[PDB]
Design a protein around this ligand. Structure first.
Ligand SMILES: O=C(N[C@@H]1CCCNC1)c1ccccc1
Ligand SMILES: [Zn+2]
Length: 140
């Protein structure tokens, strides 16, 4: 589990979004496994605006932070999961690391801020849903 709180936005894995997220929807993309909802309180997360391919992510299933190299956001075939069927996920970054389904929502961060959230795993890889292209997250 986990979310990004930036301004009056909450960024979650679309597959973990709650009744309140859907009732307060701003933007969602199934192909990206991303949902953004509106919040009463103001978040302090800052979104990275960069093409960093190094960062640190939090892995709940290890209670550990791991420094990783990750691929630039791309269209990647993702096998069926306890939560989606086999399909091309967009804006996905891959790293060598540990990721179980409950690791989704763990933050990948670089020195510029939040890069993305765990979305995929298996076969010794962790996939992060990129948020750095969502410029509108830094305003309104
Ligand atoms: O959110 C972060 N991790 C903390 C770890 C303890 C509780 N879960 C959040 C995070 C991600 C990347 C780098 C640094 C921190
Ligand atoms: Zn960066």
């Amino acid at each position: 589990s986990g979310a990004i709180y930036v301004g009056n936005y909450r960024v979650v894995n679309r597959h973990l979004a709650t009744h309140n997220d859907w009732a307060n929807l701003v933007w969602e993309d199934s192909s990206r496994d991303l949902l953004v909802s509106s919040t009463t309180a103001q978040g302090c997360d800052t979104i990275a605006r960069c093409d960093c391919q190094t960062g640190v992510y939090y892995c709940s299933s290890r209670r550990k932070h791991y420094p990783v190299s990750f691929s630039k956001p791309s269209l990647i075939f993702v096998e069926a999961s306890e939560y989606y069927p086999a399909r091309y996920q967009s804006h996905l970054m891959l790293a060598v690391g540990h990721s179980e389904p409950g690791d989704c929502g763990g933050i990948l961060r670089c020195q510029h801020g939040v890069v993305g959230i765990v979305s995929t795993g298996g076969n010794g890889l962790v996939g992060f849903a990129d948020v750095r292209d969502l410029l509108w997250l830094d305003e309104e």
